[PDB]
Amino acid sequence: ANPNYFTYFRYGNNLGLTPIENYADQFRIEAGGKLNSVKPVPTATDAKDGLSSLKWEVELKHNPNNTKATINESTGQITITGLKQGQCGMVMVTATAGEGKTAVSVKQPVFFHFSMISDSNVQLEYTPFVFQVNPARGGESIAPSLGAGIDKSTFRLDYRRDFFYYNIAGPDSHISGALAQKVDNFLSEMWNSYDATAGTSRKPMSYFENTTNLSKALGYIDQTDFKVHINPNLWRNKDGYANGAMIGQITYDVTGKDPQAATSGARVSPIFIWFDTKFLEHHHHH
Ligand code: NA
Ligand code: NA
Numbered sequence: 129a130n131p132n133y134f135t136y137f138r139y140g141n142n143l144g145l146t147p148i149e150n151y152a153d154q155f156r157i158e159a160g161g162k163l164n165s166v167k168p169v170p171t172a173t174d175a176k177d178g179l180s181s182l183k184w185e186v187e188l189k190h191n192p193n194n195t196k197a198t199i200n201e202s203t204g205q206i207t208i209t210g211l212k213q214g215q216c217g218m219v220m221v222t223a224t225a226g227e228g229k230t231a232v233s234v235k236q237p238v239f240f241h242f243s244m245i246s247d248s249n250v251q252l253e254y255t256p257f258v259f260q261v262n263p264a265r266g267g268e269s270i271a272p273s274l275g276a277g278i279d280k281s282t283f284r285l286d287y288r289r290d291f292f293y294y295n296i297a298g299p300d301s302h303i304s305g306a307l308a309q310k311v312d313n314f315l316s317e318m319w320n321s322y323d324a325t326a327g328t329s330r331k332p333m334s335y336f337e338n339t340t341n342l343s344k345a346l347g348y349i350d351q352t353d354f355k356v357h358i359n360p361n362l363w364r365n366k367d368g369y370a371n372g373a374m375i376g377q378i379t380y381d382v383t384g385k386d387p388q389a390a391t392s393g394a395r396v397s398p399i400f401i402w403f404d405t406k407f408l409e410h411h412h413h414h
Contacts, residue, residue: 132226298371
């Protein structure tokens with residue numbers, strides 16, 4: 129197209145994952161580290177005038193209750209504050225080339241994970257921590273590392289509470305925000321499609337609540353490898369397929385039991401699920 133026309137930028141990742149275009153833009157703050165040590169700058173674009181010709185803007189998406197983000201308008205350097213240990217956060221970055229009628233803007237998410245050692249010496253890390261999934265086809269995330277000394281055979285892991293969804297490029301009618309009582313949004317619609325009585329419960333996302341019908345869950349964690357599974361043909365409605373990102377709190381138990389009632393130190397939000405029909409899996413030759 130025109131002189132301002134472009135289609136992408138990239139920040140990459142600090143996880144050693146390559147090539148960077150096969151993964152979301154995503155940054156981990158290591159266990160026991162500081163948020164102010166991870167201030168990513170962009171590394172790629174198809175803008176002809178390049179990274180130092182773009183106007184950089186940021187909007188914090190997750191977690192609105194406690195996280196903030198700012199951006200250097202010239203360099204694109206992002207700074208995050210307030211994200212809590214054991215949680216992921218999400219921002220939307222907008223880059224704009226030019227001004228006026230022929231200006232072109234491109235918006236993309238950037239994700240963050242503040243890792244930690246939680247109860248019982250667990251250090252739960254998905255690498256990548258953004259699972260890019262096609263909602264028509266479904267799929268399974270990476271298997272996480274659990275931490276040194278953890279018995280994987282007695283580990284149990286399940287979604288629990290605090291589910292949030294952020295529309296990225298889906299229809300505006302996929303309303304963003306927390307799954308909550310008396311709020312009609314994309315997550316309440318998804319929940320209700322699983323069961324009219326699901327409410328704000330873990331049930332649509334739970335292994336332990338779907339043991340005899342896993343294929344019916346919106347998604348679940350398996351108890352062998354602890355991958356997150358997303359089932360096909362559910363994250364959609366008449367207006368369109370999900371095109372957006374979901375985060376939920378996940379609880380664990382180190383004694384072979386359903387972790388429903390795990391206490392506060394055995395609760396984390398270690399993974400973001402990003403739905404987009406354009407995603408095809410990169411299997412690395414299996
Ligand atoms: Na559904
Ligand atoms: Na959460």
